[PDB]
Design a binder for this molecule. Structure first.
Ligand SMILES: CC(C)CCn1c(=O)c(C2=NS(=O)(=O)c3ccccc3N2)c(O)c2ccccc21
Length: 563
């Protein structure tokens, strides 16, 4: 079965597309090597089409069926509810793509009669029709990256496939509660989206320590979405159906599976038929849950086929990392080969071949790695970090261009304890916010696929709640981390850390001068910049924050708003 079939109609833009890094008066203070930063556009959609287009074959053995039966057994304990039209509407992002039927995201959120009436008609159609393929729009994503080295210089735009707004609201009603609760029940501690950064680090560290002679590896599946077959998607449906559901929800899920999830026609922004899809749609509510369940199912069975010892997996959609009991460096390499052969038979061939790791800090999963620093008391502290190249390239772009998603904010929140997020991102962006008097302006960012509207002034409390106060006093980072950051800066032409420490003292002083929440930011976020630090005590508002739903499930491409 081919993942896609094309007509020849091009994947078209729905607006003007920029590829070169936009420059303004603030750009050079952050990055000088402008030519190293770019954004993907529809101009490379052709290259992407070739990569994601291929034949899929599956050979399912008993290990596969054994694991699936166990997953279904846990899924049977789940009771999920249907969401009312209003609840589904409120989960819709204010700037979600408008419907082709006379209404947009705001009309949905406002529960306008027109939107609500059309939504009900789509719902009724799903119940009456369980066969007609539902239309979807295919677009080229505009994402920012840094060039080099030998991966062709620049990577092609990724593709996004999504159904109409009316259908998206319907998915929420029938499956929001399911995709939010089922994964954790089925996979337990292996479900990665239930963890905050600190909790993820804790699980990785404790899992690593639970093995006599730990060995670990990340498994990179080549174009995971395209490796997902009709079988996989139907098996996913069988798992959802194991839940205790309202009869109406069962019909809608069966309908969505047959008409949308398994595949359907692809239409470009101009209304032309681009082809047909027979693999995972990247822009549906079940994309994250489906990829997670399927990755976990195939990997769990593969672990058995490979006979890995005391296996512990951590799955986030298509991102997989396994930690197990080492049986010698020789058998470890052989085991991974068997694991890989098993995954392949299941249709999930690897991109980069997997390799055994015997140093937890060298394993990258979800683009991150565990590292260590020290708190005020001098105690060793494990935290999550990553190479800052992409985060910095995106920050440069957002420095001169307002975007729907502010990656710099998401990165500060998730990587608040890191050297680079603290010295560069915080310093740079708070400087910009100060100068524009926009510290109180709520900005959107995405965490685990979901959209959140966050006020920068609330960062101190948010960071305390997610990482603890230690995020404001970590010091003495590892040489490896320091060197990776410093190297990254030289590559992009970003001023050295010493410059940022100097700038931070200024930003800090400026914030303190504003008093109120602004002062709190200067105090907590930049205490690392002064030689004579302070005490930094718990923030009252911190415990007042409603951080519910922040780290429960993944919703990548799920069109979810959690504010
Ligand atoms: C594992 C995290 C603690 C650290 C890395 N990290 C992520 O993995 C993700 C993330 N969200 S997602 O649903 O698209 C997704 C889908 C499938 C596999 C991984 C992710 N990963 C972030 O959206 C993110 C945003 C800001 C900063 C860091 C971040």
């Amino acid at each position: 079965s081919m993942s896609y079939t094309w007509t020849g109609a091009l994947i078209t833009p729905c607006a003007a597309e920029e590829s070169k890094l936009p420059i303004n008066a603030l750009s050079n203070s952050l990055l000088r090597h402008h030519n190293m930063v770019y954004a993907t556009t529809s101009r490379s959609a052709g290259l992407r089409q070739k990569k994601v287009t291929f034949d899929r074959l599956q050979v399912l053995d008993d290990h596969y069926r054994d694991v699936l039966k166990e997953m279904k057994a846990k899924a049977s304990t789940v009771k999920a509810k249907l969401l009312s039209v209003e609840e589904a509407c409120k989960l819709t992002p204010p700037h979600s793509a408008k419907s082709k039927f006379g209404y947009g995201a705001k009309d949905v959120r406002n529960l306008s009669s027109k939107a609500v009436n059309h939504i009900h008609s789509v719902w009724k159609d799903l119940l009456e029709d369980t066969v007609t393929p539902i239309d979807t729009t295919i677009m080229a994503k505009n994402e920012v990256f840094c060039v080099q080295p030998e991966k062709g210089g620049r990577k092609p735009a990724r593709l996004i496939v999504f159904p109409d707004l009316g259908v998206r609201v319907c998915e929420k009603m029938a499956l929001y509660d399911v995709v939010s609760t089922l994964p954790q029940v089925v996979m337990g501690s292996s479900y990665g989206f239930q963890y905050s950064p600190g909790q993820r680090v804790e699980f990785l560290v404790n899992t690593w320590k639970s093995k006599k002679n730990p060995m670990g590896f990340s498994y990179d599946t080549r174009c995971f979405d395209s490796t997902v077959t009709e079988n996989d998607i139907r098996v996913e449906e069988s798992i959802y159906q194991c839940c205790d559901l309202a009869p109406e929800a069962r019909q809608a899920i069966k309908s969505l599976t047959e008409r949308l999830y398994i595949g359907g026609p692809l239409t470009n922004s101009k209304g032309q038929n681009c082809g047909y899809r027979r693999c995972r749609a990247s822009g549906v509510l079940t994309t994250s849950c489906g990829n997670t369940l399927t990755c976990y199912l195939k990997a769990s069975a593969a672990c058995r086929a490979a006979k890995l010892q005391d296996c512990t997996m951590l799955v986030n959609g298509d991102d997989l990392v396994v930690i197990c009991e080492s049986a010698g460096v020789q058998e470890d390499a052989a085991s991974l080969r068997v694991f890989t052969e098993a995954m392949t038979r299941y249709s999930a061939p690897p991109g980069d071949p997997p390799q055994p790791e015997y140093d937890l800090e060298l394993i990258t999963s979800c683009s991150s790695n565990v590292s260590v620093a020290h708190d005020a008391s001098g105690k060793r502290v494990y935290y999550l970090t990553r190479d800052p190249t992409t985060p910095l390239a995106r920050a440069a772009w957002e420095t001169a261009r307002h975007t729907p998603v502010n990656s710099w904010l998401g990165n500060i929140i998730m990587y608040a304890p890191t050297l680079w997020a603290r010295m560069i991102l915080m310093t740079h962006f708070f400087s910009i916010l100060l100068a524009q008097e926009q510290l109180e302006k709520a900005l959107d960012c995405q965490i685990y696929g979901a959209c959140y509207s966050i006020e920068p002034l609330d960062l101190p409390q948010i960071i305390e709640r997610l990482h603890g106060l230690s995020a404001f006093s970590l010091h003495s980072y590892s040489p490896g981390e320091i060197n990776r950051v410093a190297s990254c800066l030289r590559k992009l032409g970003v001023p050295p850390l010493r410059v940022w420490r100097h700038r931070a003292r200024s930003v800090r002083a400026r914030l303190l001068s504003q008093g109120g929440r602004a002062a709190t930011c200067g105090k907590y976020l930049f205490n690392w910049a002064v030689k004579t630090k302070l005490k930094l005590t718990p923030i009252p508002a911190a415990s007042q924050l409603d951080l519910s739903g922040w780290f429960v499930a993944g919703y990548s491409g799920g069109d979810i708003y959690h504010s």
